[PDB]
Design a protein around this ligand. Sequence first.
Ligand SMILES: Nc1ncnc2c1ncn2[C@@H]1O[C@H](COP(=O)(O)OP(=O)(O)O)[C@@H](O)[C@H]1O
Lengths: 115, 134
Amino acid sequence: NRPNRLIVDEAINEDNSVVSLSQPKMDELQLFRGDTVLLKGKKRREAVCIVLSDDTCSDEKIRMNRVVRNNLRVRLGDVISIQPCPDVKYGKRIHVLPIDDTVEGITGNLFEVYL
Amino acid sequence: KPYFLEAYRPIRKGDIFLVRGGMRAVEFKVVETDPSPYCIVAPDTVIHCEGEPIKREDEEESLNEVGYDDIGGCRKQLAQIKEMVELPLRHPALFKAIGVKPPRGILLYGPPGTGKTLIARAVANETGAFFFLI
Ligand SMILES: Nc1ncnc2c1ncn2[C@@H]1O[C@H](COP(=O)(O)OP(=O)(O)O)[C@@H](O)[C@H]1O
């Protein structure tokens, strides 16, 4: 049934931007642990993540944490589209910036610690 | 005279050195020192008899307020309260500089006539925080 879409669900890892697939799916998606993959999401947004391999998760369930879900707007039980991107290209100093009106105890050089 | 006597107390113009006797505590402020800024007191200094009530300045907080010296016999609980409420009262910005939950409610249980409101007022005066009574 057009096996491009896939459901999202919880992840065990503490790190960000890591999707754990169900092992029986290696060569159908054709991407190994060294390939980053693009995942679609509502209001026309996307993300890209490296992938891990595990046994316990179900076939139809990606595992991914809150930070990588919110920007996709994907809420658990919702379905997103997964497509390999071996065409990855490095960047040169992506511009990164704090969010919100203010940060508690924030001053000085926060980049050598938080980045 | 008895207090300056056998003392040679160091003294600078403006200090509030307190004297105690006749079952009352009075403090005399030195307003003028012939040499400056400070001096020792000597038995050979003639003495001046004025005794006039100049009213105290508004900004200074009187010595009437209670301090830790007025409370004895509850050292452990007083130390606990001090270590518990020193940071929030005197270092408010820090608690905004870190994510932690300070206490905002304390109960004191004991028989009447033990100095609970006395302890509260002493802490309030010793940390300079505003005090409200209900
Ligand atoms: N270290 C002390 N411990 C207990 N009581 C004291 C101490 N020093 C003075 N007092 C006495 O405590 C009385 C005031 O206590 P009070 O405020 O009525 O306590 P409570 O509010 O618990 O009844 C004063 O009359 C004072 O003489």
